[PDB]
Symmetry: C2
């Protein structure tokens, strides 16, 4: 039984309650999931009657987990002051816990004690206040695993995408586009797909401009940057093609012509995925293990009220499990 | 005529291209057999195509005016706009007489649409080089139609029952889109969208405007086009009573429209609007040139001189464009 670790995230946010909701009932009840988090915090949430009931089984190591419906196995990573934590506020002890849970889960994944991680949201202000000077999970995970090259993947059965960049302006994407990064991401895609079991991954690389530039009629990015990256990776034995017209390449992948598309920018890849009804499926590819997450924040405005939806947390756990098993 | 609806015109386009054969295939059989469609084109060219046995059979009914049409299955009503030398025309070659015909059919059909004799035009493709060689200095249909109807403000619409999109920009580089994005154009396109949908019969169209940057900028974290250009356009049009909202995150706005939250999305650039439509299966690129005084449609195919007059060109997109023109024309 391949296990998933789930990190608590910021305990003052919605992470604790969406973890309990995800694991206490429904499809993931009794699933092989180990929570790395503050057990006392989980108990405070349970006492507020804002989630289904659950028994906690505290453990020291994933190999000591015992899975059953309505029980949550927890490796306790304690807050310094669990009873003093205030809901929905930026607190150093909360940012510190978010960091420590990621650190501990990462160590377990690197040892092979768990197969993958699914992360609950952290608050970057609190993370920084606690002395952890990372923009977010991605840079922290990269540091803890000595991973230089990584990229965001959206993963569904029929359409998979990996992104050259994500949360930057469209203009910045154009002004930073570069051949080394595209080659790197093609390589990350190939290794990622091999590791999920595709012996000979078929990868398509999207162009930048309409019609992939129509032979230079629109822009020069395809001839000067994208096509040379494709050629270099084809020479290195990757089954990669492109540049491909953006408005047909995702369609082609969805129809089974390719296993994954390399999208040039956030919306190029996100628009098609979310239209197909995937509004929990993001993977940080390139790390030594699979890491999933949801696109939502800590939601301090509603934290500890039971209003936050747990579906994206559950979807991220399900995805990690699916790939691991 | 014996139409039970408004009629539309179909223009032949460049006769040396695939226009003639895809018109015949569209109208001679299948869904549009007997439909209230009048072809404006060179009848002798259609007869040359029929004699090549590269299409289904069809009887031609030549007429002088749409009101004199008589619609029936496997018959095509044609207002004959003749080539200067129909028997000398060569398939799949740039020829002045072909460009001249393409122009004349558009001119004649436009006059009929403006007079109300037909309610829309669906165009077959023309060849720009031939159009220019015939002394008609236009990049293509859109500019020619805009000129003949004195239309300044227009935009490309993709139309399905669940997802409709109108474009700020289309065939330009992403960099040129970013360098030329301006508030007046966005206001104009919102206006074109509102008028188009009200005409269709949506008294209070719900229009969403897509952002430029991821998360529509995320309150400025990922760029400022939304704050400086797009949001002011939306506010200006809301002040004119348009039910317009945005800027919206690009990766959720098309999905929301598709789910029924909005009637139409204003897309900022070509791929932003084209990726979602082609993913849902609409790969033919049928589109409406919105803002003209009448409905005009077309498919995204060219003249395909490589296969012209061989019967290999697919007619499905032509048929879909005729069907869409006919449908939208009924409002
Ligand atoms: Cl109308
Ligand atoms: Ni995002
Ligand atoms: Ni196009």
């Amino acid at each position: 039984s391949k296990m998933i670790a789930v990190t608590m995230g910021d305990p003052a946010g919605i992470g604790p309650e969406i973890i309990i909701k995800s694991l206490a009932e429904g499809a993931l009840s009794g699933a092989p999931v180990v929570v790395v988090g503050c057990a006392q915090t989980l108990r405070r949430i349970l006492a507020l009657n804002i989630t289904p009931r659950a028994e906690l089984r505290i453990i020291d190591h994933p190999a000591e987990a015992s899975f059953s419906p309505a029980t949550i196995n927890v490796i306790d990573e304690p807050l310094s002051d669990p009873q003093g934590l205030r809901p929905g506020e930026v607190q150093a002890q909360a940012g510190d816990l978010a960091f420590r849970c990621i650190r501990r889960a990462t160590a377990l994944a690197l040892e092979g004690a768990v197969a993958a991680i699914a992360t609950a949201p952290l608050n970057k202000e609190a993370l920084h206040l606690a002395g952890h000077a990372y923009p977010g999970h991605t840079e922290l995970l990269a540091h803890l695993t000595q991973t230089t090259d990584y990229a965001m993947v959206l993963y569904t059965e029929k359409l998979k995408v990996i992104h050259i960049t994500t949360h930057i302006s469209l203009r910045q994407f154009l002004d930073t586009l570069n051949q080394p990064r595209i080659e790197t991401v093609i390589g990350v895609a190939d290794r990622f797909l091999r590791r999920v079991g595709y012996p000979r991954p078929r990868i398509a690389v999207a162009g930048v401009n309409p019609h992939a530039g129509e032979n230079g009629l629109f822009g020069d990015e395809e001839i000067r940057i994208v096509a040379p990256a494709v050629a270099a990776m084809r020479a290195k034995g990757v089954e990669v093609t492109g540049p491909c017209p953006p408005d047909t390449v995702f369609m082609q992948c969805h129809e089974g012509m390719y296993d994954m598309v390399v999208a040039m920018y956030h919306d190029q890849g996100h628009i098609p995925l979310k239209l197909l009804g995937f509004y929990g499926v993001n993977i940080t590819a390139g790390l030594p293990f699979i890491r999933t997450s949801a696109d939502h924040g800590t939601a301090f405005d509603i934290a500890w009220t039971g209003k936050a939806k747990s579906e994206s947390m559950a979807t991220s756990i399900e995805l990690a499990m699916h790939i691991a098993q």
